[PDB]
Write a protein that binds this ligand. Sequence first.
Ligand SMILES: [Mg+2]
Ligand SMILES: [Mg+2]
Ligand SMILES: [Mg+2]
Ligand SMILES: [Mg+2]
Ligand SMILES: [Mg+2]
Ligand SMILES: [Mg+2]
Ligand SMILES: [Mg+2]
Ligand SMILES: [Mg+2]
Ligand SMILES: [Mg+2]
Ligand SMILES: [Mg+2]
Ligand SMILES: [Mg+2]
Ligand SMILES: [Mg+2]
Ligand SMILES: [Mg+2]
Ligand SMILES: [Mg+2]
Ligand SMILES: [Mg+2]
Ligand SMILES: [Mg+2]
Ligand SMILES: [Mg+2]
Ligand SMILES: [Mg+2]
Ligand SMILES: [Mg+2]
Ligand SMILES: [Mg+2]
Ligand SMILES: [Mg+2]
Ligand SMILES: [Mg+2]
Ligand SMILES: [Mg+2]
Ligand SMILES: [Mg+2]
Ligand SMILES: [Mg+2]
Ligand SMILES: [Mg+2]
Ligand SMILES: [Mg+2]
Ligand SMILES: [Mg+2]
Ligand SMILES: [Mg+2]
Ligand SMILES: [Mg+2]
Ligand SMILES: [Mg+2]
Ligand SMILES: [Mg+2]
Ligand SMILES: [Mg+2]
Ligand SMILES: [Mg+2]
Ligand SMILES: [Mg+2]
Ligand SMILES: [Mg+2]
Ligand SMILES: [Mg+2]
Ligand SMILES: [Mg+2]
Ligand SMILES: [Mg+2]
Ligand SMILES: [Mg+2]
Ligand SMILES: [Mg+2]
Ligand SMILES: [Mg+2]
Ligand SMILES: [Mg+2]
Ligand SMILES: [Mg+2]
Ligand SMILES: [Mg+2]
Ligand SMILES: [Mg+2]
Ligand SMILES: [Mg+2]
Ligand SMILES: [Mg+2]
Ligand SMILES: [Mg+2]
Ligand SMILES: [Mg+2]
Ligand SMILES: [Mg+2]
Ligand SMILES: [Mg+2]
Ligand SMILES: [Mg+2]
Ligand SMILES: [Mg+2]
Ligand SMILES: [Mg+2]
Ligand SMILES: [Mg+2]
Ligand SMILES: [Mg+2]
Lengths: 53, 157, 148, 185, 233, 51, 124
Amino acid sequence: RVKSNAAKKREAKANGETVYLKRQAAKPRGSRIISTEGNIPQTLAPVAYETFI
Amino acid sequence: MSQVAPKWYQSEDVPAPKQTRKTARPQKLRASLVPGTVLILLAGRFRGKRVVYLKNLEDNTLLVSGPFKVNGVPLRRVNARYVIATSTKVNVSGVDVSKFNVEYFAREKEIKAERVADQKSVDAALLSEIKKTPLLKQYLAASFSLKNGDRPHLLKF
Amino acid sequence: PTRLTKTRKHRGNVSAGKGRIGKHRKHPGGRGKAGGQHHHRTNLDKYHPGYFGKVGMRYFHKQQNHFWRPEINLDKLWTLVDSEKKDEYLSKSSASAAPVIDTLAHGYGKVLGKGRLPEVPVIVKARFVSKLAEEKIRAVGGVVELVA
Amino acid sequence: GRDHTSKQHVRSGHRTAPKSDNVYLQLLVKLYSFLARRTDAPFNKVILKSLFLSKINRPPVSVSRISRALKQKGAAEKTIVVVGTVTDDNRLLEFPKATIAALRFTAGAKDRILKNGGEAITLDQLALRAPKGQNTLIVRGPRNSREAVRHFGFGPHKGKAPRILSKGRKFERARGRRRSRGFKV
Amino acid sequence: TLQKKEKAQQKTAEERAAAKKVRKAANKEKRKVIFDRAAAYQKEYTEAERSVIKAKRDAKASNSYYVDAQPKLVFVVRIKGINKIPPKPRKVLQLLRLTQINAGVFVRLTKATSELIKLAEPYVAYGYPSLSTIRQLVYKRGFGKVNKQRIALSDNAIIEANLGKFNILSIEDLIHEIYTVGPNFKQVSNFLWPFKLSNPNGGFRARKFQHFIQGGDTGNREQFINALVKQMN
Amino acid sequence: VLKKNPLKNKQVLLRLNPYAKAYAAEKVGSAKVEQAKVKPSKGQFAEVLKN
Amino acid sequence: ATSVPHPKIVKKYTKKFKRHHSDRYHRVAENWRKQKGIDSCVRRRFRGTIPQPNIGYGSNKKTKFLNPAGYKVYLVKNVKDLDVLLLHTKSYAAEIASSVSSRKRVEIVAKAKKLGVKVTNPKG
RNA sequence: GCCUAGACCGAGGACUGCGGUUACCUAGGAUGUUGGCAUAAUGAUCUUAAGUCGCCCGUCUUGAAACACGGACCAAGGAGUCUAACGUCUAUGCGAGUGUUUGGGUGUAAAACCCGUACGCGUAAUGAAAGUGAACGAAGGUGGGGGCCCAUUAGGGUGCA
RNA sequence: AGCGUGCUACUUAUACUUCACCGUGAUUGCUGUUUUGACGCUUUCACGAGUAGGCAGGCGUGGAGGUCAGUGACGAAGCCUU
Ligand SMILES: [Mg+2]
Ligand SMILES: [Mg+2]
Ligand SMILES: [Mg+2]
Ligand SMILES: [Mg+2]
Ligand SMILES: [Mg+2]
Ligand SMILES: [Mg+2]
Ligand SMILES: [Mg+2]
Ligand SMILES: [Mg+2]
Ligand SMILES: [Mg+2]
Ligand SMILES: [Mg+2]
Ligand SMILES: [Mg+2]
Ligand SMILES: [Mg+2]
Ligand SMILES: [Mg+2]
Ligand SMILES: [Mg+2]
Ligand SMILES: [Mg+2]
Ligand SMILES: [Mg+2]
Ligand SMILES: [Mg+2]
Ligand SMILES: [Mg+2]
Ligand SMILES: [Mg+2]
Ligand SMILES: [Mg+2]
Ligand SMILES: [Mg+2]
Ligand SMILES: [Mg+2]
Ligand SMILES: [Mg+2]
Ligand SMILES: [Mg+2]
Ligand SMILES: [Mg+2]
Ligand SMILES: [Mg+2]
Ligand SMILES: [Mg+2]
Ligand SMILES: [Mg+2]
Ligand SMILES: [Mg+2]
Ligand SMILES: [Mg+2]
Ligand SMILES: [Mg+2]
Ligand SMILES: [Mg+2]
Ligand SMILES: [Mg+2]
Ligand SMILES: [Mg+2]
Ligand SMILES: [Mg+2]
Ligand SMILES: [Mg+2]
Ligand SMILES: [Mg+2]
Ligand SMILES: [Mg+2]
Ligand SMILES: [Mg+2]
Ligand SMILES: [Mg+2]
Ligand SMILES: [Mg+2]
Ligand SMILES: [Mg+2]
Ligand SMILES: [Mg+2]
Ligand SMILES: [Mg+2]
Ligand SMILES: [Mg+2]
Ligand SMILES: [Mg+2]
Ligand SMILES: [Mg+2]
Ligand SMILES: [Mg+2]
Ligand SMILES: [Mg+2]
Ligand SMILES: [Mg+2]
Ligand SMILES: [Mg+2]
Ligand SMILES: [Mg+2]
Ligand SMILES: [Mg+2]
Ligand SMILES: [Mg+2]
Ligand SMILES: [Mg+2]
Ligand SMILES: [Mg+2]
Ligand SMILES: [Mg+2]
């Protein structure tokens, strides 16, 4: 990670731009759209009790 | 108490008060308080008396007359919080109340000739307008009291 | 003064700062140096090692006057020169005429060699000198004269 | 109620005034309380704190320490500041011309500074020729050279000095100080 | 001395009047800046709301499902007293600056802070605060940590003097930085003294110390944190 | 010496937020949204009613 | 308030703090003593027990030491003792010592009236 | 956005600040007015009644109101002291020295004042002892280090403890 | 007015919010206006349980040096007393 930060910093320095090297914890996910072509929702219900012995 | 002498740094000068920003604003009266409204007095000598409201003085008080002939309540001031404002109204547009103010009721038994003359002059117009409504003079001449089973939170006035 | 002691502040509190369970008994643990090998070993071993046992040989009738030999180092040797004439001696001293410092007459038995001398000849009279003390005196052009 | 993350009602643990009731030391505190409060110079804030210190926290500064501090490169004409007593050193071979401001001077110290062309001034005289401590150099004496420190942190294999009244072969040298007598610590 | 002190007071009054004239003239521009900033914040709030609404409607129309972006901010209120807390949740509550009952703090949701709040979960009620809730909190009970002292946020100069290096010049800049979790959320939320709320007007549920899901008060209530804060602030 | 609530004191509200005046002037608290009368759920979203 | 103006005087506790069981036993005087016992109901602050002195009852620093008339009271034993109250006649009142004779007490009252000093015990 | 009912509070005490309306303000803490009282309305205490709560203190104890122990009552007396030698800390005097008080001088006579040789401790340690006995160097190098010097964010120099 | 369960309102701890006052700790500033208190004045914030025990600041007693040219037979000390 030290090498990667050094490589990324010089590359941003080479391109004259900035790069952020601090690690981040996992963030909450963004918005998204769920396609339903081939994936129409299937309805589930709780199942009755059975004995299998 | 003890033997502790005052020190030189214990000053006796009284500081001035800070500049107050409590600029007074005019009194708001209840919507039911309209000149000519019949009022019920709740405290004082004339408690229970039904009287006519005439003018809002600059002292935040109400100018009131009985009329004196019907009630025995003369021209005087009352406080708005010691008054029940009923819904009965008398046309007082024909009553001249220009000369009445705070300085009229200034403290100096007997009674001024001016005050007696004003009583008669006001009561003439007041009686003239009162006669139009039947039983209004009788209503004004009768005292108010709470009967058994009277709930002031349920009664309309 | 008694008015400053904590005995005056403990008045009114039952146990006088001694505890309600432990109390202030006569001599718990013994008197004096009792139990130094059994229940006070942890104290003597930690803070006073070497306490128990014999080391070395005895010396019947030891007279400490025999071993009297106060030490003076070289950095303090010129303090025995007269204060009113020290600066003159520091200037006019040569091989032909150097100040005499009688160390025994000032109460010293041995001259030791800590520190540095002025590069100035001196005549030092001593009962004893160290090897390095005499080497430093000769280097500044001085000499050591043994006395008794 | 509060879940306290630190101890409540805790004094700073630093002296804010001298323990001494000497009125003349108070005058010096009077002067440097004003200077530290108003000059933004870090020198004046250090001096005010040093005036509070106890006797063992202001060890004497020998005239040899001042000589060695003046022998730093570019420090030969600096003003030596000692918040405490300046003592003499009869082991010096020579002393330079210097200006030294101290709480106290010994007779030998005052003689030696003035003999070599220097000045021995007080700390109030310092505040007029150097109200911000310009071109100064604070010298502190050895704190760990005290005799009481010899016995601090004593223990097995600690190498400190035992608290003992007499010294000799019969005094705390046998068991625990020698492998021939059991163990050695 | 009467005329001496009157002359000095009138002279210093004139100097103060001139300096205040100049100061107000200079500050007018700064107030225009913060006015523009607040207007822009309102505009972007409205634009984002309408954009999300439109995206939901379009996904509904186009046989799809718009999944909302996960919340980036949470408001955590300690609703439990200070007695009988195990060392690890006690340390977690101390590090969240929740050292009394009814203390509130803003937390930016990631993984480290989420696992922190999970450790303190049986002792706190938390949720996702709305913009009006943040505004009301900061306006009524907003305090700053100035030289380790709790100072009321009664003037924008205090906020500027403490957060201008983070581009916070107004109380609305601070509210925006909290709400839309900004690059300086850490400094702005740590500058904010923990909110010291009252008890709810209307009470809690019959038994607080059980999860919001099971009919209690602890855990994540999400949009009902706004009603709870309305009760308690 | 005495904290005043900007949600109660209008002068303090204008002192802290100068944009509140425009908010009041523009009736931002009751601003209408202009849009068409549409219903985009007529199709597959009726999977909510039954399945 | 005929003295230098002061805030309204507040006394947090107006009764006497009486030592526990100074009512049960004659040997126990009413002078306050703090209970130090391990089981003491008063030291443990049980509900229904007597109030105890603590720093919370301390007087307002602006009304502390002021008598009901608004003055701080200074003890006077002779006529020369009134000299320290010359510039404090509106904030300090004089109280004549009990052991001053009936002759010298008349002189103190006479000079105090001349100087404007108020006397808290003017009759005895 | 608007209207409306009630309760508690009024700390501060010339001015200083931020805003608003554009001089004034509701904007860094209550003012205005009226009535009554000053032989008193008001406040405090004591006694007592009522309501509510309140078990006997001290002690040893994990646990005492305990069916654990002392205590019928009262007054007076009544228990961490002084000394020899010491540790830490602090104040003071002098300082590589320090300590006049064993003694001598002196005296207004157990005081105060004055005097000095020795001696104690310190200034050298280590070894069982015979014995030996502290500068390679600017009294050492390295990394920090308050303060000081040169600068000009930064940077450099010097750097006591 | 029991049991299981849901709901609306309501009751009140020395707990929470705001405020007054006390103390502790910190803190802002205070000498050409420091000005007969700088061991002092002042701004601000937070906090306050406690046996054994520690420390600090105070109350009281016998006697001593100094001082009040202090009280007192025209009434000291002591004692009784809403
Ligand atoms: Mg970068
Ligand atoms: Mg009739
Ligand atoms: Mg105590
Ligand atoms: Mg104690
Ligand atoms: Mg105790
Ligand atoms: Mg006892
Ligand atoms: Mg005790
Ligand atoms: Mg003890
Ligand atoms: Mg006992
Ligand atoms: Mg014990
Ligand atoms: Mg054994
Ligand atoms: Mg001998
Ligand atoms: Mg030897
Ligand atoms: Mg040593
Ligand atoms: Mg936080
Ligand atoms: Mg309610
Ligand atoms: Mg409820
Ligand atoms: Mg609820
Ligand atoms: Mg409940
Ligand atoms: Mg319940
Ligand atoms: Mg509320
Ligand atoms: Mg009292
Ligand atoms: Mg009392
Ligand atoms: Mg009361
Ligand atoms: Mg009794
Ligand atoms: Mg117990
Ligand atoms: Mg008597
Ligand atoms: Mg006031
Ligand atoms: Mg004009
Ligand atoms: Mg205002
Ligand atoms: Mg009971
Ligand atoms: Mg027992
Ligand atoms: Mg036992
Ligand atoms: Mg038992
Ligand atoms: Mg018991
Ligand atoms: Mg039993
Ligand atoms: Mg027993
Ligand atoms: Mg028995
Ligand atoms: Mg027994
Ligand atoms: Mg018994
Ligand atoms: Mg018995
Ligand atoms: Mg003598
Ligand atoms: Mg004699
Ligand atoms: Mg000697
Ligand atoms: Mg029941
Ligand atoms: Mg139920
Ligand atoms: Mg039920
Ligand atoms: Mg409910
Ligand atoms: Mg109060
Ligand atoms: Mg201070
Ligand atoms: Mg003072
Ligand atoms: Mg508390
Ligand atoms: Mg306490
Ligand atoms: Mg005494
Ligand atoms: Mg005695
Ligand atoms: Mg005496
Ligand atoms: Mg009696």
